[PDB]
Design a protein around this ligand. Sequence first.
Ligand SMILES: CC(=O)N[C@@H]1[C@@H](O[C@@H]2OC(C(=O)O)=C[C@H](O)[C@H]2O)[C@H](O)[C@@H](CO)O[C@H]1O
Ligand code: NA
Length: 754
Amino acid sequence: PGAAEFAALRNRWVDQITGRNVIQAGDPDFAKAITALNNKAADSLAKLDAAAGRTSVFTDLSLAKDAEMVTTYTRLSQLATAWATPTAAVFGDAAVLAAIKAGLADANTLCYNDRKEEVGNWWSWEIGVPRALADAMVLLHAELSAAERTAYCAAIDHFVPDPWLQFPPKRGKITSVGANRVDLCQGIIIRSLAGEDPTKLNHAVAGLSQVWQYVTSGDGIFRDGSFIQHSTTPYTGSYGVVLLTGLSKLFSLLGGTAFEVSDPTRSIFFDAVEGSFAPVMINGAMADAVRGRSISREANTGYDLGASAIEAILLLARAMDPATAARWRGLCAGWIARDTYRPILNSASVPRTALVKQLEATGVAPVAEATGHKLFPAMDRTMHRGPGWALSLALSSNRIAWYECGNGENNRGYHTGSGMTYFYTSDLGQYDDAFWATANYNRLPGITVDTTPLPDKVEGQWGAAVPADEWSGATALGEVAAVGQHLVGPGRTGLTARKSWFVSGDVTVCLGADISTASGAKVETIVDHRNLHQGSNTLTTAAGTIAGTAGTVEVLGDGRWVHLEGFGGYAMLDDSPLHVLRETRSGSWSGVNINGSATVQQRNFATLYVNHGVGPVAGSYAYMVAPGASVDLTRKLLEGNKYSVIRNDATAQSVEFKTAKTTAATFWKPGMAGDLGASGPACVVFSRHGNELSLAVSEPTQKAAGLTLTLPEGTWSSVLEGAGTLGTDADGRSTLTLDTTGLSGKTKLIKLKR
Ligand SMILES: CC(=O)N[C@@H]1[C@@H](O[C@@H]2OC(C(=O)O)=C[C@H](O)[C@H]2O)[C@H](O)[C@@H](CO)O[C@H]1O
Ligand code: NA
């Protein structure tokens, strides 16, 4: 293959990144996309350094700061995009083209060339500039000289001689993985189009294959659908999306050509759309629990990331078999239609507009998010849904870091892996509306927390430390899940807590036991810390209302349930005091991200919490959350033993859901919770239907060869469904012994006959 094929490939990439082939005559969304393109282009043009012998290309961007070097190149590729887009203000503009060509020439001369050593963030030299510079070569291919091509290719090959590797030589080069591998290969593949280099192209293409091979440790896609980047952080929602975006674009680019991605194992990547990406998408937004440090970004939010995921999945769908195509389109139509908070077409590029328009043209109906549980034990994350809500739990353990901070981002996020309970609801802005600028990072919802102030970046950057805890894990049987976390506090306070969650189809029961610390400070547990935006939502009790005055914390009393207007109900499952605070909070995104704006955002919060006090000895909590519940239903939560606590202490935690006829339990020690028993760390959910007992079990340390339960509900003589060896103990009770060797926290489902 040759010059004909290379021109065809370049043209297809220009088509893809401009949408020049798919702008619809008189369409108002295509019109607003062009206007956004125009404004960005004009902004950049306004900031050009017009000076003779200039030392920068843009007056607000220093070439001696690598992030602003990257920004210089992305402004240039944006301007070339606009120059290439029919009906853009600068389309085919000779003067604009001139300024682009000079910008790329001077950026090369002054800074980014084959004689330059990397300084600062390697990502800028090897991914930031190459992708942008490659796009600009290809966009401007009819206009750049052979000598210009040579110099910019040379610069690129200098920083990235092999996209299977990363880091400047002075550092020791390592295997690039995951999002990094994709971005590296992208810059080289696009560069290979500009330079017509089939050798670098084939090698870059070959290198996508490693990203979708399953892994059992470190970075990549796990069999349970977890995605980790940077070893210790659940990262489906941001690095996952960068991967997904890059592969969508490259697969589509190369499909049908001599360079087509032909590896059959890529079906693992296709399976990940529903196995990894869809469960953590909530009405358009990637879950905060899976997007690591990006929560600190005012303008790279859950919706930004979920919209990018939508674009990519729509792009990929074009190439799939008919059933899979339609399913993925149905999922996307759903995430689009339910999102009236950040509609995808607001600020969409021309290509994203085209894919969303295309989707709408198929008429494919929106698929709803399925109720129930999706567990990701490899990354300490679980998802739970019912009518009106999606709960996302965020854990940490000897495998998963408390948090990632880096590059001045998320330095305060050290409690975000302390058992957070994100309840996503029709309040689509709950976590997006300056929540991470204004929230109390020491009372994040759900967490147990030692009130010792911690320094920014405590435990270090880049998730380099993990809590040395006993286990975190989960299992589920039908409508009921069991999740548990041994919380070890960050910042060496010696905080320790045993947190468990038992999630049905509507209610979530939260139990805590065995809470102590070495620090001498008070320890709290946060029933909720809910963004009210500018609202004065009522907090309704048996007595009447509580916490009417902002800033004056009040203590519930003996009705034991509280209802928050527009959210749902909360209810105490013990006689602990409930502290309720209405507060007004302020902060700027500059306060949580070194790139954040200084604008001060001000938000009202409801904060609900238990105080375990100074020096708790076996401190404990017991409460439940009922998202979407009316006052009538909230009042009734505690009536009729509907949620019947069985055990809550340092050995076991367990509840029975009276109506679901299902019992759930976590086990920290050899022991019994009512008539269920276990011989070692376990999550279990069981239900008897007549003469049959269904159980779901996991071995949550991920290290034990086996596990023995002591069966509830009488004796059991045969196994109807699944693995395990029956038996009788010393006391005439039935046992089930499992081989849990290598299960990696996964659930085993079993059925037994009396
Ligand atoms: C996933 C992540 O945090 N990556 C960082 C970069 O962020 C991303 O920008 C892109 C992209 O440029 O293709 C995709 C995402 O929307 C966004 O998260 C970030 O710009 C660089 C800055 O050095 O660091 C990466 O680690
Ligand atoms: Na890490």
